[PDB]
Each structure stands twice: as structure tokens, then as C-alpha cells.
Amino acid sequence: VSVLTMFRYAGWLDRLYMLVGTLAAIIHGVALPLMMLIFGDMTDSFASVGNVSKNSTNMSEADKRAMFAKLEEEMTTYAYYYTGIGAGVLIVAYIQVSFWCLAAGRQIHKIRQKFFHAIMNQEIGWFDVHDVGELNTRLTDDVSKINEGIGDKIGMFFQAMATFFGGFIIGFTRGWKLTLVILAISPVLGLSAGIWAKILSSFTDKELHAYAKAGAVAEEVLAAIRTVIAFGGQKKELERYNNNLEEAKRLGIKKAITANISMGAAFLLIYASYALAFWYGTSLVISKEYSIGQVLTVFFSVLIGAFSVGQASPNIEAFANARGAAYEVFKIIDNKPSIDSFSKSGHKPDNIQGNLEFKNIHFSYPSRKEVQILKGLNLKVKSGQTVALVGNSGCGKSTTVQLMQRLYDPLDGMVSIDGQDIRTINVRYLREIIGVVSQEPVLFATTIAENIRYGREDVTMDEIEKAVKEANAYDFIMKLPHQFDTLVGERGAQLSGGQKQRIAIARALVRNPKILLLDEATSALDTESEAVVQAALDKAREGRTTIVIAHRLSTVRNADVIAGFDGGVIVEQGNHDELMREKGIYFKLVMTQTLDEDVPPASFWRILKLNSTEWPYFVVGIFCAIINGGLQPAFSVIFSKVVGVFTNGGPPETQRQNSNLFSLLFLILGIISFITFFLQGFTFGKAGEILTKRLRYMVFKSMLRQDVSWFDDPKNTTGALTTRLANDAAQVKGATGSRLAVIFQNIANLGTGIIISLIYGWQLTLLLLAIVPIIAIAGVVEMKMLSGQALKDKKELEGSGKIATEAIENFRTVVSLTREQKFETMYAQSLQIPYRNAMKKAHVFGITFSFTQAMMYFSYAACFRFGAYLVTQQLMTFENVLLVFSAIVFGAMAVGQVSSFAPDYAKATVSASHIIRIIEKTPEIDSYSTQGLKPNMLEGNVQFSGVVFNYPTRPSIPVLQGLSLEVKKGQTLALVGSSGCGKSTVVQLLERFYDPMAGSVFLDGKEIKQLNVQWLRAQLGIVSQEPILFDCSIAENIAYGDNSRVVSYEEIVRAAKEANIHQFIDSLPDKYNTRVGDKGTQLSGGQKQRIAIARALVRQPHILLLDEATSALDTESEKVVQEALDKAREGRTCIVIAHRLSTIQNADLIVVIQNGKVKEHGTHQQLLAQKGIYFSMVSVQA
């Protein structure tokens, strides 16, 4: 509980300016319902002068002096009330902005500059929790969401709650009557909003699961593309996909209607609250004479407080996120564990070295698979020795190095270095005595001289020069422009891995180190540098007791003693050439050595014309948006007229008046609203009902016709297509509403405001065209100040932030100590650039918010000044001014809508162009009917000539090289090679997603180039390289009418017997019906491959492929697949592209395709008697 207190601590005045900021917000909020109260209470006096001036049948000539004096008095006094409140808000609005930007932002600066220092002064107290890259990624922005955990949202909530509560005090003071009513209706708005959330989840989550089947039946159909295209399941998957695009929208159309009804019910509750408040006010005249209008006006200002608490809700929901983001990471800021390793203080060891002796060491961190990183350690090495530490398997190796100079303190035991114990030493002096290398090729974004000072800061140019001569790295420094002060981009932008690495050796040598620690920094480097790095490290060696840790046995050959550290335990330990006889890790190592969703390219006009295909109907949703637009000004206009016709209606049979006014106020608003919300929901819902199936069908069944590289080398993972079938489609589903919402606000404001401007005394129309464009321009430029500074914040923070991304990865910071405080010293300047942007934007946003507030009271003051005064001097006007106030609110609601539409307008206008790109596609693999029912193709004696071929990423080398082949039925061609060889570059030609780069291929009498896709796959079948078995039942998976085969009991009897899968048709449960569900809930990989043999046997073909996923399944399917295949190919043109060595010894015709070059060639029967070459060129395969 309560920890919202902690986000605003370093001293005392931290809380003081926050409390003054919330007080300024409270009194700023109170000025708004006070202005509405003043504007209401003067409407009663204006109407009271109207009640004299209408009844003075023989006296209005005296009112032309006496009432006129009273009107020029009130014309004068109103200006005092407008001016005093109006000048006051300019200050307190600016103070509320100063609170949000500056009173908060000063805490954010010294919260990040507590956190940064705190991490590199807590060590074990962060290492054992969260994971690499993902931890420090969160810590970029949760210390930004902490600003909303202290944000304006709390001042908005407090000024709303203060106007609501103070509204009930002043409310009860004018009367209990309406006070009780506003208290009672408030929880009904909260309860109905609390119902909206349940009207979502209880059917959104079912609509998601209804479509989720066509999530799988999108991904599996785009992933297993070869299996579903070659077998022709593309025909079944025409409606089997689209079935889910029926059920999910049959749920969705019900939920859309209940959602629009739930929103229309909230608007009906609001308009019912207006009618009830009016009737509870008329029954303060019509009962006992408690009202002269003036008791009711206050309750309009109480409703302004109540609807302001309604605006505080989504701001408090945004804070309910930021609240969590704040205290859930604040664990690692104030009150966090702090230092184990004495990372500050301690007494300096003038011992200058000691004997290296781990004793009873453990370290318990669960490695995400091991218990402990370090499982137990005891070792002893003396001054004047070296030691190699070597291993391969499990964690723990790099843990030992952190303990060996106390960057982490050992949980169990101790480790000696120096003579006073490691739990007594001063950290800085031990960090001088010990030199430390590290594996990462990090130079930081500063000069070579600075990059050496991160070794120790207390350094001359002579110490830099000698260190780069010792490391030998001097030569390439003296070849760089500006030499030691060579300018450097992020992570060493102009230098190779090993060119950074060589300078990291000099960075250790600038300690003049008395002991040396090494950490993999010459294992798998850029090999020019790897040779020079050994030759540089071996000069940092031997002038001290040193460890060695690298894969390169060269560096290990200098060792008097070696230790086998593996998994984080010590095992092997002996002299180096004894360990070469033992066959320890040293000898073992010698024998090992010797997503783009919505992306920017739009295409205008072509987006617009697509709607002629989709909208033969449903455009009536625009008429629904027009009447829904006219509803918004109508509630303001009807209320405004209903009050004025009561206040200068007056007492004479006020029930005949009030009952008729109450009936008008409810009927025109509540009933028309609820009907309009239903009409809008039905039309928008049924437009969604056609579009949700049609748009996904058009795109998904254009991808599932799409030729050339799109399934051969698209570099997308399959889900990177489904992410577009989600996002780009969702932005367009947003625009489908937002472009109607633009018409809605155009009728609400620019249409109805002009019509209402016909029924003013027209001078107020000249005022309205001065106010409404200016307040629209104000919000329309304010949104540019807000978004433009919120964008500028990112470049000012990121330029201030490269120097943090360089270091919130590199936990090695503590290994020099000085560089922690070097970093926080520069961060004090750099994070003050974004705080100087908080100062810049506090000044601007204070002017903007005070101006946007000023235009409100200015418009109200001008409205009454040109609705009384010079107007009443001609003839007594006493109402209609509220219809100008209404039209000013039509401007305000348009600003509160056109701003919100802008990000939808930006996204969806690009999204539609990705939908266009995929619908147009490319022309080569649809269907056609060029060459069906070909009798000469009922053998498949395939002819190839001059064939050169290479898959779309051409640096993979051409796999076919100019080849000519002349095959026959009754013979088995085999591909031979090893890693990656042959497979994909055969299949790409056989489905003809792209033809040769030179040469051509005839299946017989015509090129494959000239065939129709559907009848080509009358012959095609494949052993599915995915063990895929799609949906519903095994009967629905065996056979489909794609081209020229049956779907019947006899074809599935044939295919089940000839595939040997009749094991499960004759014996066992479920059988042809088998309840596979989605992807085969009760079947092995081998049983799924047995149904691949059945899907091929449904051809009864003259050809065969033979492929992978054929000897790693469940053993009984692997033997049964071999028992079928090697008894069912001897009458076909058979082509094995499987690596499985059995098939290669059971073949007829062979080519060894060594990296796409021919190396050996012959009949298998010519080759089979040959071994040595025709053993090794097969047994090297896979």
C-alpha cells in the first residue's frame, strides 16, 4: 500500500512545490464552474428584466428608461466578474503547467541520477534477477512512466473532485433537492461504464478464439506452402479458412449491436439526468415557492464538476498503469540492497600482491537450467606461478573472475589475493593492482585518449603512449586522423572488432598492473587481429603472476599449471604437458583447433477506387453518421431553449409550461439518441460483416496465388504476414469509422452551427465566426506544440542517451570505480538537456494553456455584451445567448475529435497500400487451362537442357550449372551432397514459382513454363518435409477435388491400404473419422507422414519425389514408409532429394552436386561396386 509517497523524495521542498502545484490546480478548476455559475445567475436577472418588459402593456415606454438603466448597470458589473476571474486563471493555469513540467521533472532528474549510481553500487543486488537486453530495455522507459506516476492526472483528478465536492457544499446551501439527485445518478454512470468492460470481454475473447483457428489455418498454409500447394489442399482451404471468417463475425455482429446499445444507454442516462434535473427544479416552484430559477443554476455547475470527474476517469486509468510501472520498478531505486563487494570505502592493501587461493567458494544463481552458476571451488596457486583456466560445458567460468577481485562477494567461503583479506581491502587500490581484460570489443563514443582513461583516469600522455607501445596498437593509432584524439562514433563506428580489441589491451596496461586477469578476448576475433592480439597479450603476460583464458592453445602453452574449470566446478588440475598425457581439457581443446507493418510507401487515388468493389450497399452508414452528427449540437440547443422559455416564461400556469418543456427536453434527446446509436451500430456492424471476410479473403487468397521469390526467399518469418493481416487491416477498420466520424463532426459543427446562426439576431453570427475559427486554430496549433515538443524530447534524450546505452549493457563499469562517477558527472549535464527541454516546454505550454483558457471567458463575455447592451437598447432580448454558447461548444467538440482522428488518418492511409500491393501481386502461378488431360504426360520421361539455376539470394552459388538430363519411368534419380545441398532449388522449379536462369525443362512435349498449375498437380505428390495434418478428420485430409480425382469411400480405401495406414482403419478406435481437431491432437509425426503417403497415392501418379522428415518420427512409421516406397517406385520416374543414406544405396542414376558443381556422375549400378570415394561421398551427407 501507500508507496506513491516514495516517487517524490530526495529532500523536504520536493513535496512542498507538489502540494502548492495541486493547490493551484484545485483553485484553477474551481474558477471554471464559478464562471458557469456567474453566467447562469446573470441569465435569471436578464430574464427577470424580460418578465417586466413583456407585461408592461402601458408601461414599456418607462422600461425604455428604468429597465434600460438596470441593463447598463448590469452591462457594467458583468465586466468586473468576467475580468476578475478571467485574469486570475491566466496565473494558476501556468502554475499547474509548472507543477507538471518542473515540480515533477526535478525529481525525475535525481531519480534517474539516483538509479544510475545505485545500480553500479549494488552488484549482486541486481545480477540474480531478470535477463540480458530485456531488463535494461524496460529500464529505458519505466523511469519515464514514473513521470505519469507523479503527473498532471492527479491535479486533474483533484481539481475535478474539488469542483464536484465543493459543488455539493454550495449545492446543499442552495438546496438538498438537486444535491441528492446528482449524488444518486453518479454511481449509475460508473456502473454502466463498468458494464461496457464486460460487454467487451465476454464476446471479444470468444471472437478472438473463433478466428484463432484461421490464425493456425493462415500460418500452417503459408509455412507448409509446398505441401498444401503440391497436394492441392489450396482448394479445401478456400472455404475451410473462410468458415472461421463466418463464425467470428456472427459473434462480432451481436457484440457490435450490444456495444452500440451500451453507449446509447449512457447518452440516454445523461439526457435523462438533464430532464430529471429540470423536473426536480420546476417542482421547487410547483409545490412550495422555494425557486425563482436561481436555486437551479448552481446545479449546472455541480454537473460540470461531475462530468469533469468523468474526464478524470481515463486520466486515472492512465495513472493506474503508470502507478504500477512506478512502484513495481522502484524496488531498484531508493531502499534497494546496495553494496556487497565494499564497492566504496575499505582500507588500502600496501601488500602489492598475494597468493591466488579460492577456499570453499559457491554461487547459487539459477542459470535458467542449472542450480548454481558455481557448484563448489577450492584451488591454490602461489606468487611466481601462472594458471590456465579452461572448460567448455555449462556456466560458471566467467563467475570465477568476478569473485577473484570482489565485483561480487562469494556467498560461501573466501578467495585470497594480497595479505589483508578481500573483506577488508579498499576497492580502488585493488582495482589498480589488478589489470583486467574483457571479451567485448567496446570502445566508447569518445577519443582513444579517453578510452585509455577508462582503465584509470589519473594518467598522462606518456602513460597512454607507453601503454599502446606495450599493446603494440600504436601503429594504427598513428595511421588514424587526429591520432590519440581520433574522433569516434558509437561503439567505435569506423573500426573493426579486433581494432577496438587491441586498444582494450592498452586500457588494461595503463594500470602498470601487478596481477593480470583475462576473459576470452582472443577467441573467434577477426583473424588478422587475432594473431596480433595474441602477440600483444603475450607482452602483457609474464611480467606478473597471470591467469590465461582463451580457446587458442598458443596462449595456454605458457602455463606451469592448468585447471579444468567446467560447469562452475574444479575437476582436472596439473602441469600443462602432464594434462596433455592425461587428455584433460587442454588436449580436448588442441584436438578442437589443431514486423514491417504499416511502413511508409502510400499510394493515393488507388486506395479510393478499391471501395467500388467492396461497397455495392451499406453506404447508408454515412446517413447514420450525419444524423449522429446533428444529435450533438441538438442536446445543447434543446437545453438552451428549454431553460430560456422557462425563465422568461414565468409563473402564469407554469405547469402547462413546465410539463410541455420537460416532455420536449427528454423526447427529442433520449429516444432519438438511443435509436441513432442503434442505426449507426447496425450499419457500421453490417459494413464490417462483409469487409472482415472479403478483405482478408482477397489478401490471403492473393498471397496463396503469389509467384516469384515470395515463397522462395521472402526473408519474412510466416508470422510477419499474419501481423499485417492483423495491423494494416485493423488501421483500415479504424479508418472505416474515422472517415464517418469526420462527417459526423462536420454536421455537428460546420453544418448545424451555420443553421443555428440563422436564428441569432445576426450580430452574434459575426461574433461566432470571430470565436469558432480562432478556438479551432488554437487547439489545432496547440496539438503541434504538444506533439512537436514530445518528438523533440526524443532527439534531445537520445543524444543525451547514447552515452547510457553504451554503459547499461557494460556492467564492467565497476572494474575501474572512477568511471561510475565520470558517467554520472556527464549524465548530470546530458539529462539536464531534456530538463532544459522541460523548462522550454513549461514556458511555452504555460502560455498555450493560459491562452486556450482565456479564449473561453473572452467568448462568454463578448456573447452577453452583444446579446444585451446595444441589442436590448433597440428591443429587449432576454434569451438565445445560450445558442451562441452552444455553437462555441460545437467548436470545442470538433477540436476534441479531429485531433483524435489524426493518428488513425496517418496510419490507415499507408496500411491500405500494403493491401493494394498484395492484391495486384504478379502473374505466374494462379490456375490457367493451357494444357490439361495430356496423354503424353502419363509417363513423365522428363527432359532438361542447359539448366543454370540459383535461388533469389545469388551469393549462395548456382546449384545447377548448365545441366542436361534425360530421365525415364522405371528409374530412380538421386541427388548427392551434404549440408544445405540441392533441395529448395529443385522444388522452386517443380512448382514453377520461378523458372531457370538459363536452359529449359519439359515434363514431356511442352515446357513446365507453359502448363496450368491445377492439372500439373494431377501428377505431383511429395513426402511432406513438415509432418503436417491440417484439420477436422483424416478423411478430409486424404483427398480433395482440385483437378481430376474423386473424393469417395473407394479412393480413401485405396489410399489407406496402399499407404499401410489401414493398421488404424482395420484395428483401433476413431479410424477414417480420426478427431485430429487442429494439427492432429492424438497422432505422432510418423502417423502424419503415413497420411502424406495417402495424399500422394490419391494421384496414382507416373512420377515420385522422395524427401526429408523420413527417419526421425516413431520407428514403426519409418520402416513402414521405407517398406512402401521401395516397393512402389520401380514403375515411375522417381527422384530422391532426401539425404537418407538407404535411398542413395537403392537408386539407379546419381550426380554428386558438390556446392552446386558436378564432382561424380554415373548410374548407381556403375557406382555401387565402388567404395572409398563412393563410400565417403555418401556417408558425409546427413
mmCIF file of C-alpha atoms in Angstrom, residues 105-273:
data_model
loop_
_atom_site.group_PDB
_atom_site.id
_atom_site.type_symbol
_atom_site.label_atom_id
_atom_site.label_comp_id
_atom_site.label_asym_id
_atom_site.label_seq_id
_atom_site.Cartn_x
_atom_site.Cartn_y
_atom_site.Cartn_z
ATOM 1 C CA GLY A 105 10.726 16.828 -13.600
ATOM 2 C CA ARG A 106 13.363 17.915 -10.982
ATOM 3 C CA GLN A 107 12.535 14.688 -9.072
ATOM 4 C CA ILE A 108 12.838 12.626 -12.338
ATOM 5 C CA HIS A 109 16.393 14.026 -12.893
ATOM 6 C CA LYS A 110 17.621 12.995 -9.361
ATOM 7 C CA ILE A 111 15.566 9.723 -9.535
ATOM 8 C CA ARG A 112 17.500 8.639 -12.702
ATOM 9 C CA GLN A 113 20.678 10.121 -11.091
ATOM 10 C CA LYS A 114 19.948 8.001 -8.005
ATOM 11 C CA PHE A 115 19.169 4.825 -10.048
ATOM 12 C CA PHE A 116 22.310 5.089 -12.307
ATOM 13 C CA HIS A 117 24.736 5.496 -9.331
ATOM 14 C CA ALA A 118 22.662 2.932 -7.348
ATOM 15 C CA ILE A 119 22.935 0.055 -9.930
ATOM 16 C CA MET A 120 26.790 0.273 -10.061
ATOM 17 C CA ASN A 121 26.660 0.352 -6.211
ATOM 18 C CA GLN A 122 24.510 -2.816 -5.604
ATOM 19 C CA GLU A 123 26.218 -5.563 -7.700
ATOM 20 C CA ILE A 124 24.726 -8.964 -6.508
ATOM 21 C CA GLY A 125 21.546 -6.972 -5.615
ATOM 22 C CA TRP A 126 20.618 -6.812 -9.343
ATOM 23 C CA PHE A 127 22.554 -9.698 -11.045
ATOM 24 C CA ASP A 128 20.316 -12.587 -9.794
ATOM 25 C CA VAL A 129 17.036 -11.055 -11.265
ATOM 26 C CA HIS A 130 15.614 -10.517 -14.816
ATOM 27 C CA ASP A 131 17.528 -11.258 -18.081
ATOM 28 C CA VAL A 132 20.005 -9.584 -20.504
ATOM 29 C CA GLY A 133 18.724 -6.966 -23.013
ATOM 30 C CA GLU A 134 15.099 -7.227 -21.719
ATOM 31 C CA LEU A 135 15.852 -5.839 -18.174
ATOM 32 C CA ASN A 136 17.787 -2.748 -19.351
ATOM 33 C CA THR A 137 15.224 -2.206 -22.204
ATOM 34 C CA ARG A 138 12.408 -1.858 -19.551
ATOM 35 C CA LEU A 139 14.679 0.453 -17.501
ATOM 36 C CA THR A 140 14.859 2.870 -20.509
ATOM 37 C CA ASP A 141 11.138 3.788 -20.111
ATOM 38 C CA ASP A 142 9.682 2.696 -16.686
ATOM 39 C CA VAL A 143 11.808 5.613 -15.300
ATOM 40 C CA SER A 144 9.747 7.659 -17.880
ATOM 41 C CA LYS A 145 6.278 6.185 -16.964
ATOM 42 C CA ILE A 146 7.292 7.187 -13.359
ATOM 43 C CA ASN A 147 6.663 10.815 -14.571
ATOM 44 C CA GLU A 148 2.945 9.896 -15.115
ATOM 45 C CA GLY A 149 3.122 8.219 -11.636
ATOM 46 C CA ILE A 150 3.669 11.871 -10.449
ATOM 47 C CA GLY A 151 1.764 13.526 -13.361
ATOM 48 C CA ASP A 152 -0.924 16.141 -14.166
ATOM 49 C CA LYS A 153 -3.547 13.280 -13.995
ATOM 50 C CA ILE A 154 -3.508 13.710 -10.162
ATOM 51 C CA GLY A 155 -4.036 17.525 -10.420
ATOM 52 C CA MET A 156 -6.885 16.920 -12.951
ATOM 53 C CA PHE A 157 -8.438 14.344 -10.560
ATOM 54 C CA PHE A 158 -8.021 16.672 -7.514
ATOM 55 C CA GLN A 159 -9.465 19.766 -9.329
ATOM 56 C CA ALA A 160 -12.370 17.593 -10.644
ATOM 57 C CA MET A 161 -13.016 16.095 -7.141
ATOM 58 C CA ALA A 162 -12.734 19.581 -5.513
ATOM 59 C CA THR A 163 -15.261 21.096 -8.019
ATOM 60 C CA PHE A 164 -17.556 18.038 -7.553
ATOM 61 C CA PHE A 165 -17.320 18.133 -3.688
ATOM 62 C CA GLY A 166 -17.400 21.977 -3.378
ATOM 63 C CA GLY A 167 -20.308 21.802 -5.868
ATOM 64 C CA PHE A 168 -22.206 19.594 -3.343
ATOM 65 C CA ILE A 169 -21.465 22.121 -0.490
ATOM 66 C CA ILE A 170 -22.681 25.211 -2.477
ATOM 67 C CA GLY A 171 -25.359 22.841 -3.904
ATOM 68 C CA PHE A 172 -26.763 21.862 -0.464
ATOM 69 C CA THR A 173 -26.521 25.591 0.525
ATOM 70 C CA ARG A 174 -28.983 26.489 -2.345
ATOM 71 C CA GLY A 175 -30.879 23.200 -1.606
ATOM 72 C CA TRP A 176 -30.869 19.462 -0.715
ATOM 73 C CA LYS A 177 -33.345 18.769 -3.633
ATOM 74 C CA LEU A 178 -30.904 18.509 -6.601
ATOM 75 C CA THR A 179 -27.848 17.692 -4.376
ATOM 76 C CA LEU A 180 -29.276 14.199 -3.622
ATOM 77 C CA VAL A 181 -30.119 13.601 -7.350
ATOM 78 C CA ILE A 182 -26.568 14.276 -8.679
ATOM 79 C CA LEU A 183 -25.141 12.053 -5.866
ATOM 80 C CA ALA A 184 -27.607 9.241 -6.833
ATOM 81 C CA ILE A 185 -27.075 9.293 -10.681
ATOM 82 C CA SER A 186 -23.213 9.425 -10.426
ATOM 83 C CA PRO A 187 -22.764 5.668 -9.493
ATOM 84 C CA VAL A 188 -25.235 4.705 -12.339
ATOM 85 C CA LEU A 189 -22.777 6.237 -14.872
ATOM 86 C CA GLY A 190 -19.926 4.327 -13.103
ATOM 87 C CA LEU A 191 -21.977 1.055 -13.104
ATOM 88 C CA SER A 192 -22.910 1.380 -16.832
ATOM 89 C CA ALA A 193 -19.223 2.075 -17.742
ATOM 90 C CA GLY A 194 -18.386 -0.985 -15.537
ATOM 91 C CA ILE A 195 -20.892 -2.923 -17.763
ATOM 92 C CA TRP A 196 -19.185 -1.745 -21.054
ATOM 93 C CA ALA A 197 -15.974 -3.591 -19.985
ATOM 94 C CA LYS A 198 -17.994 -6.877 -19.579
ATOM 95 C CA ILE A 199 -19.903 -6.309 -22.896
ATOM 96 C CA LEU A 200 -16.394 -6.275 -24.463
ATOM 97 C CA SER A 201 -14.520 -9.228 -22.806
ATOM 98 C CA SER A 202 -17.394 -11.775 -22.673
ATOM 99 C CA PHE A 203 -17.527 -11.735 -26.542
ATOM 100 C CA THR A 204 -14.180 -10.152 -27.786
ATOM 101 C CA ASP A 205 -12.360 -13.113 -26.252
ATOM 102 C CA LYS A 206 -14.750 -15.588 -27.998
ATOM 103 C CA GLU A 207 -14.360 -13.677 -31.340
ATOM 104 C CA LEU A 208 -10.547 -13.985 -30.961
ATOM 105 C CA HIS A 209 -10.761 -17.788 -30.287
ATOM 106 C CA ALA A 210 -13.290 -18.184 -33.170
ATOM 107 C CA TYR A 211 -10.743 -16.553 -35.551
ATOM 108 C CA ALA A 212 -7.686 -18.263 -33.849
ATOM 109 C CA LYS A 213 -8.397 -21.446 -35.923
ATOM 110 C CA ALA A 214 -7.832 -19.229 -39.043
ATOM 111 C CA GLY A 215 -4.697 -17.958 -37.260
ATOM 112 C CA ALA A 216 -3.381 -21.560 -37.440
ATOM 113 C CA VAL A 217 -5.077 -22.113 -40.896
ATOM 114 C CA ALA A 218 -3.192 -18.976 -42.024
ATOM 115 C CA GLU A 219 0.296 -19.791 -40.577
ATOM 116 C CA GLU A 220 0.324 -23.562 -41.429
ATOM 117 C CA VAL A 221 -0.965 -22.822 -45.001
ATOM 118 C CA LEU A 222 1.774 -20.154 -45.553
ATOM 119 C CA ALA A 223 4.520 -22.245 -43.787
ATOM 120 C CA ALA A 224 3.700 -25.737 -45.233
ATOM 121 C CA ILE A 225 3.122 -23.925 -48.583
ATOM 122 C CA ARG A 226 4.803 -26.677 -50.698
ATOM 123 C CA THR A 227 2.745 -29.479 -49.073
ATOM 124 C CA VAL A 228 -0.629 -27.597 -49.378
ATOM 125 C CA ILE A 229 0.053 -26.303 -52.971
ATOM 126 C CA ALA A 230 1.503 -29.610 -54.365
ATOM 127 C CA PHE A 231 -1.272 -31.826 -52.853
ATOM 128 C CA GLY A 232 -3.897 -29.165 -53.897
ATOM 129 C CA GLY A 233 -5.292 -28.607 -50.330
ATOM 130 C CA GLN A 234 -5.389 -24.929 -51.507
ATOM 131 C CA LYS A 235 -8.900 -25.987 -52.846
ATOM 132 C CA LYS A 236 -10.179 -27.186 -49.364
ATOM 133 C CA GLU A 237 -8.501 -24.153 -47.710
ATOM 134 C CA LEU A 238 -10.684 -21.817 -49.895
ATOM 135 C CA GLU A 239 -13.707 -22.164 -47.518
ATOM 136 C CA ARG A 240 -12.017 -24.093 -44.586
ATOM 137 C CA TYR A 241 -10.170 -20.808 -43.811
ATOM 138 C CA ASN A 242 -13.273 -18.634 -44.554
ATOM 139 C CA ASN A 243 -15.544 -20.760 -42.243
ATOM 140 C CA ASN A 244 -13.808 -19.010 -39.285
ATOM 141 C CA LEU A 245 -14.403 -15.625 -41.037
ATOM 142 C CA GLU A 246 -18.129 -16.553 -40.745
ATOM 143 C CA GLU A 247 -18.399 -17.686 -37.040
ATOM 144 C CA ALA A 248 -16.081 -14.932 -35.644
ATOM 145 C CA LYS A 249 -18.210 -12.176 -37.312
ATOM 146 C CA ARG A 250 -21.520 -13.965 -36.372
ATOM 147 C CA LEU A 251 -20.297 -13.367 -32.784
ATOM 148 C CA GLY A 252 -18.911 -9.889 -33.739
ATOM 149 C CA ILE A 253 -22.230 -8.541 -35.207
ATOM 150 C CA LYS A 254 -24.060 -9.482 -31.932
ATOM 151 C CA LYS A 255 -21.345 -7.782 -29.793
ATOM 152 C CA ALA A 256 -21.269 -4.649 -32.026
ATOM 153 C CA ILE A 257 -25.069 -4.220 -31.519
ATOM 154 C CA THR A 258 -24.776 -4.710 -27.690
ATOM 155 C CA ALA A 259 -21.789 -2.272 -27.564
ATOM 156 C CA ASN A 260 -23.667 0.467 -29.529
ATOM 157 C CA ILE A 261 -26.750 -0.154 -27.283
ATOM 158 C CA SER A 262 -24.482 0.169 -24.163
ATOM 159 C CA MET A 263 -23.063 3.509 -25.455
ATOM 160 C CA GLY A 264 -26.555 4.769 -26.476
ATOM 161 C CA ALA A 265 -27.761 3.803 -22.952
ATOM 162 C CA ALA A 266 -25.029 6.053 -21.395
ATOM 163 C CA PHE A 267 -26.086 9.018 -23.629
ATOM 164 C CA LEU A 268 -29.749 8.205 -22.719
ATOM 165 C CA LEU A 269 -28.781 8.243 -18.966
ATOM 166 C CA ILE A 270 -27.055 11.660 -19.468
ATOM 167 C CA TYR A 271 -30.101 13.175 -21.300
ATOM 168 C CA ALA A 272 -32.440 11.567 -18.697
ATOM 169 C CA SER A 273 -30.314 13.285 -15.958
#
